[PDB]
RNA sequence: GACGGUGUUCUACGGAGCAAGGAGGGGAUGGAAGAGAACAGGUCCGUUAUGCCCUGAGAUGAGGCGGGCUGCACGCGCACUACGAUAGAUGGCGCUUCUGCCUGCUGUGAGGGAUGAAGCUGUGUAAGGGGCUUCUGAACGUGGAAUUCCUAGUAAUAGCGGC
């Protein structure tokens, strides 16, 4: 959309998070408590409630491109693995948390299908609720 | 400094035959047993429910006797059954986790089982040689 | 302390090339005087000395 | 670095002997007379057989 | 519409007191930050056109684990001279240049005969030799009070800039020329 | 409607800023306003040409610049050049052209490569050695 | 032939010092309270030398007295903080 | 329509069929005497000089620059004089 | 069509330094190239290049199957990863871009990651060689005499292509 640009990238994903949490219609994975995010990472994460940040930090960037994939999704939220006596390489998350996510949009009817415009007017409008919020 | 830290702290904690350090956090502190990580460690610690934030030192008897029977069978607090470094045994078939002294006796097993059926991996294993690929002719000296 | 200003460059006598030999001219009382510096030194410029004694040659 | 061959040298006294009396003071004016005279290739050849009597000229 | 180094502190008023050095400490290139790509600086006379910010900053990205980070080395000093400005009241950009002053020695010794001649002579120092050794003193005192110590980079320069402004006797730049001028005047 | 657009470089980084006329300043890299801007090195590099021309010689001009390639310093110094050559082709069609000849001399005292591009260039690597100038080490025994 | 120089000749990690507190105690932290709202400058590490306490536990105690007492944030980093006095 | 294009390994013998052939299609059906120009295409490979491990190790490499013009004009029957040239790869469709 | 051309300071009239103007400045940058001699330098394991000797059916020829070239008391040459706060962990921002930037925890063996255990998997006729998950967690506290590479978009740091 237009006007996702004006706020702070890091208020937005405040703005939706707290307002995720507050539906009781979202549901984790089997288990979020346990798992770390990634195959190039040791320990998990130090907040307790990534799964909201990280859902938030999808819903941005599926209002900017217009459509994405299950495999831009990994590539996006990589590391850099320690390899011990090699130099280190760079690998992406797991691809479950990534399909997880576009699925939970979907039931809650968010995003339709369309390959080229992941986005219904329940969710245009959801969106933009939270811009004229932050300014 | 109201509430944020405590007014005072036990420096020695025991448990499971290993002196924890008493003014640690707590997930780090159950590093010092052998067989616990830092990554199983902070798993039992969450599903439990204590205070991820709080040190070792200051803990009543009601938990540190609640977090030293999780430590017996984690597949009770209900961790996965691929985060347990002994699954599926050779000899009956049952996945457990080892912890502390019965670790160095699993190992000991193994080594005496193999030389009554003369294995190979059992006999550089126990005079101390290089049992996966590598090649000793300049390192490992 | 004192200065004066290197008006000619004699040349570059060092073990190694390392010291330069120059001519400097005190202010406070006009005085030709020789002596060696170590630094990369030019015309026109001024130098410091805690003494003005020595001439080196 | 900045030496003249003898092949660019040896060509710009044989200019300044015969049409010498074409040739004035001004690097301008001594390139377009050499692209007249002389029949050569290199464009760096002419630039130095111009640039040496230019030098000559004044002397 | 005046340029100061960070949006705080100014150019002029940063009287540099000497008149040898004068001529070779740059505060005339000014800019709201130490940082200027140019070629200008290229060349025998082009070490007299690096601003007096900017070489200070340079000498503290060494140690190749260090190699190229100037952006973090630029982002320490902010902290530096707020340190200084809140603790001593003046301008930190003027107590910089009195360091370099006061630090920089002037007579030391060389070599002139042949392993039975061997003879410490003694000599003075160019201006612009004289500045390359006193930045070299100030940036090693900082690396070593930093090690494996529990202080911050920042704090270890400006206890080090404070205590070479004023000849305190706890800076590692001027009890090392201290030396250098006290042996270079026994060799005579 | 009065625009004109220009094109700066730094190393392999390209820029172009689209230069329109309102009423209002403004400045929006990549889209995003000159507020919300999170890399200082960008902000202390912009806004020392705004002091070296004075604001009042730009009080209504909104600019739009981009830059989609490169590295990071690289690209600063990119932006940086396509905004101030920016501010004298505009000086020059709609305006006091005697206007464009005397800020045009207080941008080229400031710094030369604000208005022209660097032309350093890297250099190609020889066998035998890491780099263009290094050798491997040499072992003489 | 023989590696015989190549041993290092060297000594035995150069003496610790003892660990630092992790607890505060009132009567202290009135004594931090005593001298540290007239001062210029103060950081996390001229608290925990004089007082010999874990540098974590050093900020806490910091920003506690920050929201009522007289010291008062003047800019922070994820590598420093610095607290000004309100004399 | 036709589309005449060219290429060749060396240049000095493709410029000449790209003006020979300027004069003798001058005066016939078709007009705008040029030749488009695209840029040239490269191969290349790297390897030892040495033909054993003495030595010190010296590397070389080759390449194979081809270059190519383009015509475009069309005209109705108007040739076997482009046939008769040894080196450039002329192709007519 | 950039020539030390123009000015300037020295010259043996061969040329050299420093300035301005300039998209480019002092062999415009980096390469490619490189007479005629020498060495008993290397290659017969590169070649249906080659003289002489050796070998010839239970062949020193041609195939098929297993083993080895990877064995390990010890001496040496080139490298990769480290010995920590100018840092490690975890998140956010940039995308078909990048090797960066901001950051709640750690105040020190949470630095380092060798060696080995149990369980899951890819290529292939054949693999405890190759990857992944939990556990185990060495030596190492910036290195003796000696010694190598390097003059600017280079040295050093972090990486991506191809063979």
Redesign the interface.
Known sequence: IEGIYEVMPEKFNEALKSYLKSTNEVVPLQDHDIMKTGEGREQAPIEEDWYFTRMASIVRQISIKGAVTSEFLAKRYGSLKNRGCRPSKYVGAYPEIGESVLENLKNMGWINEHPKDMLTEKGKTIVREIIEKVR | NYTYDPAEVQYIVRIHNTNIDGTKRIPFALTKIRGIGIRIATAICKRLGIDLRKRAGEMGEDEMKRISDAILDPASVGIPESYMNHQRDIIDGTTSHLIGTRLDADLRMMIERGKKNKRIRAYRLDVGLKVRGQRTKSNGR | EFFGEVTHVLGRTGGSGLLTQVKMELMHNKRTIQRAVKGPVAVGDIIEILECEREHR | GCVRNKIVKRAARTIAEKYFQRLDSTFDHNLLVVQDVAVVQSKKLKNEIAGYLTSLYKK | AEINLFEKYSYEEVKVNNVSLRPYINLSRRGIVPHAATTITKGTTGKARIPIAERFVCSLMRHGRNSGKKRLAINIFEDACFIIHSMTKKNPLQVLVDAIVNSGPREDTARIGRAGSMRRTSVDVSPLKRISIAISNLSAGIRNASFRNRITLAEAIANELIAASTNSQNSYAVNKKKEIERIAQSNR | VKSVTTQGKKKRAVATCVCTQTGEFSIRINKVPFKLITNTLMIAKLKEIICIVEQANIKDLSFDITCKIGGDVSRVYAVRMAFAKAILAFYGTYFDEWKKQEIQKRLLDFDRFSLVADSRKREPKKFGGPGARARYQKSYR | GTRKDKKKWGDGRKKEEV?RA?????EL?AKVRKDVGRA??V?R?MI??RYNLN?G?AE??L??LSNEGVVQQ??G?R??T?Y?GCR | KVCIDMASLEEKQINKVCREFYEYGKTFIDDLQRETVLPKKVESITTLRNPSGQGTKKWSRYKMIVHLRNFYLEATHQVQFLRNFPHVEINLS
Request: hydrophobic share 45%; aromatic share 4%; net charge positive.
């Open positions: 660990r992790v607890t505060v105690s009132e932290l210029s400058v950081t590490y925990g030398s540098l536990v806490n105690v920003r506690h003047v800019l980093n590598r420093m610095i000004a």
